[PDB]
Structures are given as structure tokens and as C-alpha cells.
Amino acid sequence: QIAPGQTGKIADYNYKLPDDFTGCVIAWNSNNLDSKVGGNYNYLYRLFRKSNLKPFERDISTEIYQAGSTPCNGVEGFNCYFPLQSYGFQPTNGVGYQP
Amino acid sequence: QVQLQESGGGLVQAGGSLRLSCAASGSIFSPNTMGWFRQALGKQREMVAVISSIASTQYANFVKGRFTITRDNTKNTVHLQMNSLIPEDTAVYYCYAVDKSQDYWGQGTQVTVSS
């Protein structure tokens, strides 16, 4: 999902890459660096937002998103969810789920 | 290296009180936001509460009117007053510094309440 013109939860909600990139995406797999036996939940991930970003936009807001019709007022509940879910980085995870 | 010192948990009978503490060292630029999160074995991080530099306090409905957050501007530290405890509060808690840059978490504070 890190390349220009792409979509997905990361490409639409996390870090939008304009179709006109000049530059390089270089990644590695921190299986022996970032995973712990009990699960490393220090890396947080949003799945819900009101709208998609603009390129190189950063939102660090923690406002609770309103999935229903009623307002959440900064409190979870029915149709109210926090933005960030954490990741189960574990050294026994499969290649797709590894860091 | 931003470091958060968290202390003050343990085992307390139902109805007791505790006072956790998180002290922030390192960069911690002035517009910071310090919050506390809950995790019981088998669940995710449950945001207990949040305070910003504006002095505003935001709490979830899980513990309405029971948990409080106190600030120390001189040392820029935070204390969680943990009162009217119920076995549903049995969860390890963590600290979250929003700050303006890289976020940093704590090491954990065990809070157990049962009879």
C-alpha cells in the first residue's frame, strides 16, 4: 500500500501518496527487532475516519468516531469507537502479519 | 530518550483506593497530552482517560465519577487517583504521551482488586 495511486486502509487513511511521486519506498521486516513474545501493542492503527486524507497529511487526533447517528462526545459506546487499535506483533506470526 | 516512570499499583481489596504516578522525562515539548489506558488479559487497550495542557480532563463511561487525574506543572507529572475500585478494574494500565512527535508508552502497573 506504500506506492502512489494506491488505496487501502493505510493508503486512504494513514499516509496518502500523490500519483506524482519522485522518490523511493524502502522497507525491511523487523521480526527480530519489533516483535515480543507477549505481543507488541505499542504501534497503533486507525481503521475509521470521517474522510480520506490529502497527500503527506498527518492527523494525530484521538477523537472518537461516530459510526451511528448519535454523537459520541468523546466517549465510546454503541456505535462509538476509539480511532486506534493496536497490532499483535509476535515472533511466531506469519509473513503477512510480521513487522 | 523519552522515559515515563509509572508506579503506585498493586493488590487492593474491593472498595479500596490507590494513587498511580507517571513522570515524563526527555524531550516532552510544552504542548503535551498525558493519558492512561487499560488492558486486561484478553482485551485491547482501553483508554481510561486523557488530560491536555489546557487542563481539561476527559474520562470514559466505564468508570463514571470514580477515577481522577491530577497534574503537577512544576515537574510536569501526573497522578491517577484510583478510588471506589471494582473487580472489573482488574487490568494492567499504561501511560500515553501524545506530545507533538514520536509517542512513548510506559512499562506497566498491575492493578488487582478482588475478594
Please state the three-class secondary structure of B28-62 as a single string: CCCCCEEEEEEECCCCCCEEEEEEECCCCEEECHH
Phi, psi of A98 (to 5 degrees): -75, 160
CB B36 within 8 Å of CB B92 = no
CB A36 within 8 Å of CB A99 = no
CB A7 within 8 Å of CB A16 = no
Using the beta-carbon criterion (under 8 Å), do B47 and A62 form an inter-chain contact?
yes
Which DSSP letter does residue A79 get?
T
Query: Which approach determined this entry?
Result: cryo-EM
Q: Which residues contact B29 (CB under 8 A, 6 or more apart)?
A: B99, B100, B101
Local structure of B68: helix, strand or coil? strand
The CA–CA distances, whole Å, from B110 to A7, A45, A94, B10, B94 equal 41, 25, 31, 6, 9
Cell numbers standing for residue A89: 506483533
Which residues of chain B does A77 touch, with a Cβ-Cβ cutoff of 8 Å? Answer: 61
Cell numbers standing for residue A93: 506470526
Cell numbers standing for residue B94: 499504561
Of B44, B103, B105, the CB nearest to A85: B44
Which residues of chain A does B98 touch, with a Cβ-Cβ cutoff of 8 Å? Answer: 60, 62
- Burial bucket for residue A82 (CB in 10 Å: 0-12, 13-18, 19+): buried
- Burial bucket for residue A49 (CB in 10 Å: 0-12, 13-18, 19+): middle
Closest CA relative to residue A15, chosen from A44, A62, A53 = A53
Closest CA relative to residue B61, chosen from B81, B82, B46, B77 = B46
CA angle, residues B41, B57, A73, in degrees to nearest 5: 80
The Cα–Cα gap between B55 and B69 comes to 10
CA angle, residues A36, B99, B42, in degrees to nearest 5: 35
Which residue in this structure is represented by grid cell 519489533?
Answer: A34
Q: Which residues contact A24 (CB under 8 A, 6 or more apart)?
A: none
Of the residues B29, B41, B45, B96, the best mutation for testing chain A's interface (the one with the most A CB atoms within 10 Å of its CB) is: B45
Closest CA relative to residue A46, chosen from A61, A32, A30, A67 = A61
Phi, psi of B33 (to 5 degrees): -140, 115
The Cα–Cα gap between A95 and A6 comes to 21
Strand order of the β-sheet with B67-72 is B3-7, B18-25, B77-82, B67-72
Which DSSP letter does residue A86 get?
E
Cell numbers standing for residue A49: 475516519
DSSP letters along A28-74, please?
A: ---TTTT--TT-B--SEEE---SS---TT------PPEE-SSS--TT
Q: Which residue of A has its CA nearest to B107?
A: A42
Going by their DSSP bridges, the two strands B77-82 and A65-66 should be labelled as: unpaired
Q: Which residues contact B101 (CB under 8 A, 6 or more apart)?
A: B27, B29
The Cα–Cα gap between B91 and B40 comes to 4
